Amino acid sequence: NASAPV
Amino acid sequence: PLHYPPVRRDETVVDDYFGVKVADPYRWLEDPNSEETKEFVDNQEKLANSVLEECELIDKFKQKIIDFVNFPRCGVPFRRANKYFHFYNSGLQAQNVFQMQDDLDGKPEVLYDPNLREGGRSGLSLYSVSEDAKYFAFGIHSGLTEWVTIKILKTEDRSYLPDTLEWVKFSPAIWTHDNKGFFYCPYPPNQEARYHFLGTDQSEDILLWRDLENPAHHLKCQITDDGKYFLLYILDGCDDANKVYCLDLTKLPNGLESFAPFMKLIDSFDASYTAIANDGSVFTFQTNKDAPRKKLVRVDLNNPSVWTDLVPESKKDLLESAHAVNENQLILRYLSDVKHVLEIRDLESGALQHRLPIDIGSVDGITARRRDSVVFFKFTSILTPGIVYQCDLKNDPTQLKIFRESVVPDFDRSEFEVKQVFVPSKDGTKIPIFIAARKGISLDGSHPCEMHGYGGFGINMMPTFSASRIVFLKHLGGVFCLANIRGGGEYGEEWHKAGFRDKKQNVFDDFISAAEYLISSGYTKARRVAIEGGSNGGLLVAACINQRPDLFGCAEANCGVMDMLRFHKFTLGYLWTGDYGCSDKEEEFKWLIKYSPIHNVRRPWEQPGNEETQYPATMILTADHDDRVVPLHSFKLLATMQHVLCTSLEDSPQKNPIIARIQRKAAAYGRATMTQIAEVADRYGFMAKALEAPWI
Numbered sequence: 001n002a003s004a005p006v
Numbered sequence: 007p008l009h010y011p012p013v014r015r016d017e018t019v020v021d022d023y024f025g026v027k028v029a030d031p032y033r034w035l036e037d038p039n040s041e042e043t044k045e046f047v048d049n050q051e052k053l054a055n056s057v058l059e060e061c062e063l064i065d066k067f068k069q070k071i072i073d074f075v076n077f078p079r080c081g082v083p084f085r086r087a088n089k090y091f092h093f094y095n096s097g098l099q100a101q102n103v104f105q106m107q108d109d110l111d112g113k114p115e116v117l118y119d120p121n122l123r124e125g126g127r128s129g130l131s132l133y134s135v136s137e138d139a140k141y142f143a144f145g146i147h148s149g150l151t152e153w154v155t156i157k158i159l160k161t162e163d164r165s166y167l168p169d170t171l172e173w174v175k176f177s178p179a180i181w182t183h184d185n186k187g188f189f190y191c192p193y194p195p196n197q198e199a200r201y202h203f204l205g206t207d208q209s210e211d212i213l214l215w216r217d218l219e220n221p222a223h224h225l226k227c228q229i230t231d232d233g234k235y236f237l238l239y240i241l242d243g244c245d246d247a248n249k250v251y252c253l254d255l256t257k258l259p260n261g262l263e264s265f266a267p268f269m270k271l272i273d274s275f276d277a278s279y280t281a282i283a284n285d286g287s288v289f290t291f292q293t294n295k296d297a298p299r300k301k302l303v304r305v306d307l308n309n310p311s312v313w314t315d316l317v318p319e320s321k322k323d324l325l326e327s328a329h330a331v332n333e334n335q336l337i338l339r340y341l342s343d344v345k346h347v348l349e350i351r352d353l354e355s356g357a358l359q360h361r362l363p364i365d366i367g368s369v370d371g372i373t374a375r376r377r378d379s380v381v382f383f384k385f386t387s388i389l390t391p392g393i394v395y396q397c398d399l400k401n402d403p404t405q406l407k408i409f410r411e412s413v414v415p416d417f418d419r420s421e422f423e424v425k426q427v428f429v430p431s432k433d434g435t436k437i438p439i440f441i442a443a444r445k446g447i448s449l450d451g452s453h454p455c456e457m458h459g460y461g462g463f464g465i466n467m468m469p470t471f472s473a474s475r476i477v478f479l480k481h482l483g484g485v486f487c488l489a490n491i492r493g494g495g496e497y498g499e500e501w502h503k504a505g506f507r508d509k510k511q512n513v514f515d516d517f518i519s520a521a522e523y524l525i526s527s528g529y530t531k532a533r534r535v536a537i538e539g540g541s542n543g544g545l546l547v548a549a550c551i552n553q554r555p556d557l558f559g560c561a562e563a564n565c566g567v568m569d570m571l572r573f574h575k576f577t578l579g580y581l582w583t584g585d586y587g588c589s590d591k592e593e594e595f596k597w598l599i600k601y602s603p604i605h606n607v608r609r610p611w612e613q614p615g616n617e618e619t620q621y622p623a624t625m626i627l628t629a630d631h632d633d634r635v636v637p638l639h640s641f642k643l644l645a646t647m648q649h650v651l652c653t654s655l656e657d658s659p660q661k662n663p664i665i666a667r668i669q670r671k672a673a674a675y676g677r678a679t680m681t682q683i684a685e686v687a688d689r690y691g692f693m694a695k696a697l698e699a700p701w702i
């Protein structure tokens with residue numbers, strides 16, 4: 001559940 | 007023009023490993039609370055900031071990353087009763103927000119917003135909705151520790167139940183179909199399996215399983231789609247192997263209030279078993295038993311000796327996961343040469359019905375249940391930010407339809423391409439790698455190159471979307487490589503085993519050989535290659551720069567495991583001895599001493615013919631408070647590398663900087679957008695500097 005695909 | 011701080015050595019610390027004397031002059035860095043260790047951190051922080059201010063492209067990277075990340079993201083929806091639940095992020099929120107809706111394209115309502123709590127320092131890692139859709143059980147971190155507290159909200163009005171469950175880590179909350187409560191797996195104030203009735207205090211929770219005799223055994227659990235069986239899985243280490251205990255809930259005289267009488271269907275650690283479906287007592291399992299590429303098997307619990315292949319093991323492809331869907335069907339997710347293939351089959355006969363091969367990238371997040379006729383899943387890729395696909399198996403089983411589609415602002419994917427090629431390793435084995443770059447580039451050796459890898463623990467590295475990677479590609483004229491080296495599980499268990507324990511070194515040889523290929527093919531050149539990796543991937547970076555520093559210009563190891571002699575002594579290092587060995591045993595020490603990063607730092611310029619070589623520019627990244635990979639690993643390596651290569655000599659040929667980027671007041675987990683961007687921007691600015699690469 002990562003916040004954003006950085 | 008660089009000023010390394012003084013770092014005390016304790017020349018009295020020496021250990022004898024089976025007749026071999028090993029000094030540990032930086033033993034004192036293993037206490038993260040001593041003021042010396044804090045002063046160490048403060049000095050390295052000062053050094054790093056000093057070096058990073060020389061890296062003038064950080065500001066430019068940071069902005070382009072932000073701009074490229076700033077697009078809305080709807081996660082894969084799942085259904086409970088008549089409601090649909092999914093994660094959302096408008097683009098640059100610290101953490102994703104959990105949302106609920108009555109209709110798929112109806113008005114979202116916010117169920118829980120982690121950004122309101124502690125500035126969104128951490129997001130939801132446990133989230134679980136009851137069968138009736140009335141209750142949402144979720145995990146909140148209290149501080150920088152790994153410990154979670156489980157709270158429960160009513161979905162109708164977003165009001166909390168008084169229930170508070172402490173002492174939880176990674177457990178999920180498994181709801182019974184009566185909606186009276188859920189199973190979970192906490193630790194005592196020796197993991198346990200408990201059931202919690204809604205409206206009661208944690209003290210009242212029913213105990214289902216412990217094993218005081220085997221404290222290190224840990225648990226996962228599950229309940230069947232029909233709600234009749236509770237399944238408890240017991241695991242040993244980070245091995246892909248587990249037990250299977252089944253509890254039949256229909257035969258309990260007084261529900262769970264009685265209390266346990268498990269049918270121990272699998273009472274050993276020989277193979278992995280994951281329950282996919284059942285029809286009464288007839289179960290379908292995914293297993294790796296006699297099948298390193300896995301398969302589905304079927305067994306009746308009333309006659310548990312007899313197991314029967316339903317879908318046999320493929321000679322070539324890993325059966326990575328399986329899902330019962332649309333009452334009587336299966337979706338199988340095969341991994342074929344590191345590319346996904348979905349198959350649709352009959353549940354009963356196991357017969358193939360349809361076969362959908364997938365473009366380079368990754369499908370995952372299939373959360374549909376057996377009663378659902380509409381399957382959703384997520385696809386991503388180097389050049390594809392994120393599509394949620396839908397497949398309605400009832401009305402249109404053949405076609406995948408786009409349900410949500412992310413768009414990166416101001417980015418034309420058609421200027422770039424991604425190829426998969428296979429390259430030979432030292433022992434002849436072919437190694438798949440993915441290579442991403444601008445279309446039509448000249449293979450003239452000129453391009454800066456970033457190579458990423460992991461190589462361990464059965465983990466499959468897939469070419470997913472990274473926004474900062476696009477920046478690297480577009481604005482640094484770069485070439486990205488992802489290497490599927492051994493130790494992973496990409497070709498099943500034999501690919502895992504060929505890169506672990508005594509054969510760990512093959513993992514490093516595979517990575518080195520990928521770099522050798524990228525050089526010989528004309529993509530890049532010696533010294534213009536950057537490598538990056540995290541955890542076991544950090545071990546990968548650090549071992550490879552010890553062994554072939556000549557090859558690399560820049561190296562970035564993230565929360566890496568660098569003291570392979572002592573790793574097992576700390577926190578949860580004991581669960582990695584499956585893959586690594588343990589220095590407690592002589593045969594295994596002999597593997598480890600050879601690649602253990604902190605015990606293999608040597609001046610490359612002191613070897614014949616190698617006078618012109620130095621270690622690459624090296625950034626070592628960690629939190630000050632990592633409880634998984636304790637930062638003493640990263641610190642001790644830094645100290646060692648700094649001493650051996652810099653501060654032990656009056657005017658050393660090691661001119662490439664060696665620093666640590668140290669994240670303050672951070673945990674291993676949960677990583678807020680922005681915090682995360684900051685880190686990546688720092689490491690890419692550094693990289694651009696080390697490779698002498700201009701901006702575009």
Ligand SMILES: C[As](C)(=O)[O-]
Binds near residue numbers: 463
């Ligand atoms: C968290 As690990 C050391 O298994 O990559």
Ligand SMILES: [Ca+2]
Binds near residue numbers: 059060
């Ligand atoms: Ca400046």
Ligand SMILES: [Ca+2]
Binds near residue numbers: 559698
């Ligand atoms: Ca250089």
